[PDB]
Amino acid sequence: MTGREILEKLERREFTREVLKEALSINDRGFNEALFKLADEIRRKYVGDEVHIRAIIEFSNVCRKNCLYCGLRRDNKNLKRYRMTPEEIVERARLAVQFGAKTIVLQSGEDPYXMPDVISDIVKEIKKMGVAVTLSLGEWPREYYEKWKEAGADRYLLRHETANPVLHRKLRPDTSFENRLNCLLTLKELGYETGAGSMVGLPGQTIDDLVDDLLFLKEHDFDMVGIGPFIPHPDTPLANEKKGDFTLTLKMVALTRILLPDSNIPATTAMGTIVPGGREITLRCGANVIMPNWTPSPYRQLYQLYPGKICVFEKDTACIPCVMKMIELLGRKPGRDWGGRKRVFET
Numbered sequence: 001m002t003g004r005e006i007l008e009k010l011e012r013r014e015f016t017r018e019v020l021k022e023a024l025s026i027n028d029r030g031f032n033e034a035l036f037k038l039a040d041e042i043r044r045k046y047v048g049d050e051v052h053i054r055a056i057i058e059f060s061n062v063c064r065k066n067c068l069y070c071g072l073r074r075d076n077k078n079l080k081r082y083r084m085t086p087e088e089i090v091e092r093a094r095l096a097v098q099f100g101a102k103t104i105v106l107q108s109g110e111d112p113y114x115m116p117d118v119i120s121d122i123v124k125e126i127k128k129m130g131v132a133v134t135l136s137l138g139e140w141p142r143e144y145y146e147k148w149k150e151a152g153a154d155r156y157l158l159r160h161e162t163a164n165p166v167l168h169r170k171l172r173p174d175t176s177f178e179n180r181l182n183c184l185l186t187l188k189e190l191g192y193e194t195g196a197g198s199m200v201g202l203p204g205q206t207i208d209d210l211v212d213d214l215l216f217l218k219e220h221d222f223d224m225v226g227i228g229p230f231i232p233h234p235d236t237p238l239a240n241e242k243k244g245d246f247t248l249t250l251k252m253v254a255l256t257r258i259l260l261p262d263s264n265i266p267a268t269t270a271m272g273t274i275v276p277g278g279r280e281i282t283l284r285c286g287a288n289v290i291m292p293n294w295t296p297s298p299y300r301q302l303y304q305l306y307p308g309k310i311c312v313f314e315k316d317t318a319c320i321p322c323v324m325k326m327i328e329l330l331g332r333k334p335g336r337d338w339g340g341r342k343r344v345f346e347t
């Protein structure tokens, strides 16, 4: 089908595998731009003009896992490891709330030290501030997830990374797609708002793989979907592999919006890392969430999933004000509430 035909099918919501592969495979400028306009329009129609700010505190870069793409992988000995104390995390959280953050995201490598009781304590103290708490701590026992829910956690981000179980296993040798998926399913059952998502341009990943990621996201109707390009980190086995294409990743964001019109989709730090102004672009192509880095110095510079992360040289407190300005110059509006998913039931 031609680009015009694919758009009309997408507009009609005939989301066949073939329509999705063709969408990802056509490189025509005119087609891409129309696809971005569609997704921008569906975003506006379903989730409005509010850009939700999730203040992310990356509280530890310790990790027991060895994912091949990740600078925090345990085999990376060329990284200063840190752990924030629960007091520092709580007080850093409080500063974000004082700055107007309505969701706190606590993210870390898979660091056993905190698990589960110290996270429980931290979540309970943060929840007292009357904001949403989102956890992004990786794969843990059902029991841990349960304790964290009971402690007051609202949401959990656990990117599925890749729905190709063979590629998944090769890139994440400690675990599997089955395990990853089971965590997402457990999270959902426990009542978390859950986030999935994938990297784009992983070594060995094909367009068919990306289509499978879309159909997976659509299958499970995730509340949130984080998508970024793969960015090689020099202290990893994937150091000399090619970074993910910005445009292709932006197309995955657009199609995710089209497939899940009422989902919460961030313009991820990785998009802004590979293209100057990439998050702003992404916010105009389907995304409606931003997650300003609230990780304090001198730890911020040490949380290197991938290198070059923008926002590492600014003052600790700069990213909240910066994203507020961003939201305003994009002609958008800050989130007025916790910005949980607001389901519009359709056919």
Ligand SMILES: C[C@H](CCC(=O)NCCC[N+](C)(C)CCCS(=O)(=O)[O-])[C@H]1CC[C@H]2[C@@H]3[C@H](O)C[C@@H]4C[C@H](O)CC[C@]4(C)[C@H]3C[C@H](O)[C@]12C
Binding pocket: 097, 098, 099, 100, 101, 320, 321, 324
């Ligand atoms: C933290 C300190 C000291 C006082 C304090 O501790 N303030 C708690 C505020 C609590 N809330 C954010 C929940 C207010 C919501 C009321 S509101 O009327 O905005 O809905 C106060 C003093 C002035 C405040 C900044 C300015 O104002 C400008 C700007 C407005 C944006 O908007 C949010 C970002 C920013 C940078 C503000 C951040 C923060 O806040 C500041 C630094």
Ligand SMILES: Nc1ncnc2c1ncn2[C@@H]1O[C@H](CSCC[C@H](N)C(=O)O)[C@@H](O)[C@H]1O
Binding pocket: 069, 070, 071, 107, 108, 109, 110, 136, 137, 138, 139, 157, 158, 159, 161, 198, 199, 228, 229, 230, 231, 232, 233, 270, 305, 306
């Ligand atoms: N090199 C890289 N390039 C782009 N994104 C990467 C990356 N390394 C890691 N990421 C992204 O960063 C996300 C958060 S990693 C931190 C959360 C937790 N350890 C977990 O694994 O889920 C990952 O899910 C991954 O998609």
Ligand code: SF4
Binding pocket: 063, 064, 065, 066, 067, 070, 071, 072, 073, 074, 108, 109, 110, 138, 305
């Ligand atoms: S992606 Fe998460 S689990 Fe994998 S090495 Fe990085 S921080 Fe650890």
Ligand SMILES: [Br-]
Binding pocket: 054, 103, 105, 134, 155
């Ligand atoms: Br969130």
Ligand SMILES: [Br-]
Binding pocket: 140, 141
């Ligand atoms: Br465990």
Ligand SMILES: [Br-]
Binding pocket: 157, 225, 226, 227, 266, 268
């Ligand atoms: Br995300």
Ligand SMILES: [Br-]
Binding pocket: 228, 268, 269, 270, 271
């Ligand atoms: Br990211």
Ligand SMILES: [Fe+3]
Binding pocket: 292, 293, 310, 311, 314, 318, 319, 320, 322
């Ligand atoms: Fe910033």
Ligand SMILES: [S]
Binding pocket: 292, 293, 311, 318, 319, 320, 322, 323
């Ligand atoms: S930012």
Ligand SMILES: [S]
Binding pocket: 311, 314, 318, 319, 322
């Ligand atoms: S920033």
